Amino acid sequence: SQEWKEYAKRVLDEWQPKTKLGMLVKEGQITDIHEIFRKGYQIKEPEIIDVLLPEVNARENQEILDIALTVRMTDSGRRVRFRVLAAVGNRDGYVGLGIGHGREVGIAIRKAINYAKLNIIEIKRGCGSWECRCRRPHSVPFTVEGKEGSVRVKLIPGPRGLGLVIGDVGKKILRLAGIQDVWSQTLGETRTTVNFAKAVFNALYNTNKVVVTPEMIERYGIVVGRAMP
Amino acid sequence: PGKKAPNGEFAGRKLKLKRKKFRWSDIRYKRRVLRLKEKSDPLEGAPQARGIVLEKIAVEAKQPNSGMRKAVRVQLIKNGKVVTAFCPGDGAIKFIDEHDEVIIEGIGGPKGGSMGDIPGIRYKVVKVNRVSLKELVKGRKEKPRR
Amino acid sequence: VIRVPLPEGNQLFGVVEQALGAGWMDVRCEDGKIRRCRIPGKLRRRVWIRVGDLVIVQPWPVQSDKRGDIVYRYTQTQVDWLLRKGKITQEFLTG
Amino acid sequence: MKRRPRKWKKKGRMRWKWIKKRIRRLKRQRKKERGL
RNA sequence: ACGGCUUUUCCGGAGUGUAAAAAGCUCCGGGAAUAAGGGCUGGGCAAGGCCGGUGGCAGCCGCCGCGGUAAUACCGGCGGCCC
RNA sequence: GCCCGCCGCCUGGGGAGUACGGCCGCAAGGCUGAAACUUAAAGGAAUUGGCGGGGGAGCACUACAAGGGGUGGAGCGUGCGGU
């Protein structure tokens, strides 16, 4: 955990921020990822995450879901430009997902990985199945649903050891977030990975929109963010 | 649009009738209870047949292709009907003589029917005089009856 | 000398009477039986055949009656050139 | 005559008002000429 | 390529087994000796950017789709992949 | 839009609202209504462009309007098709 902890010490000098959160961070005031979120800020500098989540760039916490080239016609032929979809996250409690556009594949990948750090969220984990009744953060705490495009998803808790039973580009997103067991039930057209990816993302977000009592917490084990890494 | 029609507690009969009556608008279930494949089917519920050749022909391929596909006209035994079969392999049409007892399979396309560019052929030869056409086409074995 | 589509192999000489349609050409050869030529796909693009064009075709050993198949045409610099050698007599074109 | 509005759409076909009129002229012959 | 080793399987032989046989099982003598094919190799779908034929012809193709004289897709050889 | 009732209709495109059989009407015609077979798409809402014998704005003697000189008819110089 060292090379990804001197990285922040190198970055924290050559970076003279322009927004305000940049000032707060660079003056040692704000010092932990769990305290820029539930407060209504804006995030426009992608160096803030390199300093508080320095592992988000480790090439095994990165992922390239799809690449597709699109076209528009003109009186001098066709003008073709790419579209990439990419997700990033430490495999603990935080994820982000973005798109990016360009006219070559390294530039589209670069912008995608950028915009995937400015779209980051934290989730809730637990164990809410009927079979397993331990208290460990390996699964969703209770069934949630999220919709997008024309694609409805629903994520159901599952017992420890059963893998991830969902589509192909759901496994990457749910593995980068820390979830390890789940079930699933979908509808609509699940062949357009943009909409399928955005529905899974929205469900994971909606995880933290359900009201819980201070006693339901010590029955599912709900951890928010990291949980003793 | 309302909610859904017979959602009562003592409304079983109307519900079962609704479902039984709208199951017939299907086409795979209808084609099965009436047994319509049979009595329109020259092979009569079988996975092979044996016939006696009558002649040798060739067909034109589809619109965006070019060539002629060799084929034969087989006359069955258990019925007496006439079907058109297709000889697969490079140089098979050089073994099928007249007055041969050939065997006949499907061709494996969509819905059991035809496939590829050959549009109306739906049977393919496998055995000629009880020697697998596959072998004959590539050496490896000798042919009986001349 | 000259490279001309002579009868090579088993070729036939096609001089057509009428196009019933969709590529069928009734041909009138020195053989006698009504032959009905059809066309491959390599030439249906760049060439242009009509009546009076003596051309070359190829027949098929099946029934030897209504056969023939275009493989190559003739240009106006050959159709009457082929008279002096007498390789073909043109009175198979006026009766 | 239990019509279906998908066929007035004129895309790759001819007018329906004039197809019906031609189905009728055949049902008049299959009936007179020994449709008895 | 040299050195050693084993005998499940394989040949003979003795008990036992069985209504009588046969298989089987326990002991002996020989010997690494007697024993791998089938389908795929363009994408879906693991696996070659190699060689020689074929020239809209021959052929392939569950669907999309290759072949027009510079074929990773047809026919072979050499490599490789799944059981 | 979120809920509590009841009834009618839909199941890829054609074949076909056709054939056969019934009940109505004086006739035209109405209501009910399949299978063989054929086919990989048929359909919907929006986006860049191109086009219109659609609309506005602006142009240009390889456009016109106002003008000056002509080529097209005869003979020769030279290039092309054909023979």
Added chain:
RNA sequence: UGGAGGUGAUUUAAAUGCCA
């Protein structure tokens, strides 16, 4: 800023398109 209706008018003739 932006739309929905109504009444009027709308002008000689002018057809067709290998192959990749």
